Amino acid sequence: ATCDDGRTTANAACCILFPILDDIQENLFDGAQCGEEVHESLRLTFHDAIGFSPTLGGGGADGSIIAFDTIETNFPANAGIDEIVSAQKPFVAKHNISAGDFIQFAGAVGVSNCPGGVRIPFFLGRPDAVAASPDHLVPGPFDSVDSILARMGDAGFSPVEVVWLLASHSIAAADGVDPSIPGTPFDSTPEVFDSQFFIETQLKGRLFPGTADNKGEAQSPLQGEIRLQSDHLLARDPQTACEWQSMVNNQPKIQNRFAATMSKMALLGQDKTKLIDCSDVIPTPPALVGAAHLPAGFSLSDVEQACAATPFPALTADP
Numbered sequence: 001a002t003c004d005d006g007r008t009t010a011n012a013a014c015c016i017l018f019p020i021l022d023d024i025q026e027n028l029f030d031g032a033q034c035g036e037e038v039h040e041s042l043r044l045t046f047h048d049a050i051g052f053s054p055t056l057g058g059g060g061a062d063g064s065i066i067a068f069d070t071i072e073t074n075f076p077a078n079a080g081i082d083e084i085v086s087a088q089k090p091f092v093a094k095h096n097i098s099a100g101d102f103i104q105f106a107g108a109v110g111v112s113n114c115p116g117g118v119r120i121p122f123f124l125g126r127p128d129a130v131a132a133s134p135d136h137l138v139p140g141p142f143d144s145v146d147s148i149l150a151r152m153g154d155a156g157f158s159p160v161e162v163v164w165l166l167a168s169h170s171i172a173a174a175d176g177v178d179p180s181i182p183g184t185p186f187d188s189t190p191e192v193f194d195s196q197f198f199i200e201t202q203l204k205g206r207l208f209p210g211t212a213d214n215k216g217e218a219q220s221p222l223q224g225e226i227r228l229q230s231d232h233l234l235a236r237d238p239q240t241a242c243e244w245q246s247m248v249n250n251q252p253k254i255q256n257r258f259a260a261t262m263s264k265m266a267l268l269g270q271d272k273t274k275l276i277d278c279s280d281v282i283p284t285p286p287a288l289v290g291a292a293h294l295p296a297g298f299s300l301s302d303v304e305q306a307c308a309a310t311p312f313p314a315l316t317a318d319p
Ligand code: HEM
Pocket: 036, 039, 040, 042, 043, 045, 046, 080, 139, 140, 141, 142, 148, 162, 165, 166, 168, 169, 171, 172, 173, 174, 175, 176, 177, 178, 216, 228, 230
């Protein structure tokens, strides 16, 4: 099909996304940048979708975190999410798509602005949300590995899928974990969707980048990075450490698994066969240029190797 302005897409119903795409790129992502608004919109896709529990309810990726923001933004795990909900609400009011489609569309378009990124499959047609998420369904950084895996498993993700979705922390920073140092990233390349997050969480911790006593924070290996305790533990737990290390210097696997697992997450509470595939509307992301590395000056002796089956790969660092 050819839309009214000449852009093409496989299914005609997808044409309504083009003006939305142009508005988001200009007015939500500040001229299609891979910056904080993209990182915030990707976090929002997960805080919207993971409100899904077979025993308690919630409609998953349904827009409830916007539609019922008065409730869901009161949950402590949603602290800080109100800013991006407020930013997106007027786009949903202006355009003619549901809040659940909007949140997944904006996260997929955002990720396409990041070098190394992928086009997350995107389906159009989710109905408006009909219930708020139950409380207590979003994992937090002070939760044990067993607790996070049980919650993600309950929503339908295996432990290796947890690891694959946490590639999102390659384009991520924290404002709440240590409020003295807002905007401190989880890896050294928060505008590049790469394997640095999986490498740098494996380093021995050295210091706290801000204050020392924050709940859910581990020591970081570098002054300009922050480390969640949940990431510290998942990189070292026998349930997940082998998969974590397998992502290092493995950009094809990061891309293939993040796209597929993001799509499964974007579809929680929905049925793909009732929606319209509009994947080809998402922009084509830039590719990576630089190789994966340890931080300069670090060596394999600074890595806490946690996979008994396979040694950590011998990457270069300091030239
Ligand atoms: C599985 C357990 C997870 C835990 C415990 C967790 C925890 C957190 C925490 C504590 C923050 C920082 C919030 C702040 O203080 O500002 C954060 C940020 C973020 N999270 Fe995760 N997360 C998890 C999974 C995910 C998943 C599956 C996604 C996929 C979309 C995601 C995407 C993000 C993004 C992109 C940010 C950066 C937000 C920004 O820079 O503005 N997280 N996460």
